[PDB]
Amino acid sequence: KNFSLRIDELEEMLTNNRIWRNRTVDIGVVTAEDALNYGFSGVMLRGSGIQWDL
Amino acid sequence: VKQDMPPVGGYGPIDYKRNLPRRGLSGYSMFAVGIGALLFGYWSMMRWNRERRRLQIEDFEARIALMPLL
């Protein structure tokens, strides 16, 4: 019950911050084909637009 | 028997959605507040600087009066 408010506090802290974005907006861009051919699984696929969950 | 089970009606609601209330004012309000603060500061500074110029002129003419004896 209380963990949703905890996640809301964390997302208020980190997501909207501009300094947090400046370290993460254009860092480590991986294409879908290069993620598939490198044996990536999980979030590495799901952050690249590949719809795949076990 | 006795085990760990949920009740007959189940448990209460549990949230899983992002909650950002969007608290604050519009841009026009804060910009107008800043402009009004700037205008108030400019007016107060103009009044105090004119008074300080008059005081400096008075002190300078005091030195003008005191110069020949020195």
mmCIF file of C-alpha atoms in Angstrom, chain B residues 17-46:
data_model
loop_
_atom_site.group_PDB
_atom_site.id
_atom_site.type_symbol
_atom_site.label_atom_id
_atom_site.label_comp_id
_atom_site.label_asym_id
_atom_site.label_seq_id
_atom_site.Cartn_x
_atom_site.Cartn_y
_atom_site.Cartn_z
ATOM 1 C CA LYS B 17 0.207 4.552 -11.307
ATOM 2 C CA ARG B 18 2.468 7.593 -11.533
ATOM 3 C CA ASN B 19 1.141 10.504 -9.453
ATOM 4 C CA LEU B 20 2.462 14.003 -10.213
ATOM 5 C CA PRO B 21 -0.020 16.640 -8.970
ATOM 6 C CA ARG B 22 1.302 19.526 -11.170
ATOM 7 C CA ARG B 23 1.451 22.168 -8.459
ATOM 8 C CA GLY B 24 2.389 25.740 -9.280
ATOM 9 C CA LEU B 25 1.459 28.884 -11.196
ATOM 10 C CA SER B 26 1.396 29.669 -14.898
ATOM 11 C CA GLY B 27 4.311 31.387 -16.614
ATOM 12 C CA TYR B 28 2.528 34.734 -16.923
ATOM 13 C CA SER B 29 2.095 34.958 -13.143
ATOM 14 C CA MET B 30 5.748 34.363 -12.244
ATOM 15 C CA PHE B 31 7.008 36.592 -15.063
ATOM 16 C CA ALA B 32 4.698 39.412 -13.927
ATOM 17 C CA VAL B 33 5.858 38.928 -10.323
ATOM 18 C CA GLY B 34 9.486 39.209 -11.433
ATOM 19 C CA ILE B 35 8.791 42.321 -13.512
ATOM 20 C CA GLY B 36 6.977 43.965 -10.593
ATOM 21 C CA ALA B 37 9.854 43.163 -8.238
ATOM 22 C CA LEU B 38 12.299 44.657 -10.755
ATOM 23 C CA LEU B 39 10.228 47.842 -11.047
ATOM 24 C CA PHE B 40 9.955 48.242 -7.262
ATOM 25 C CA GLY B 41 13.703 47.757 -6.862
ATOM 26 C CA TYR B 42 14.434 50.247 -9.648
ATOM 27 C CA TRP B 43 12.190 52.896 -8.068
ATOM 28 C CA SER B 44 13.695 52.455 -4.594
ATOM 29 C CA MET B 45 17.212 52.560 -6.040
ATOM 30 C CA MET B 46 16.456 55.748 -7.994
#
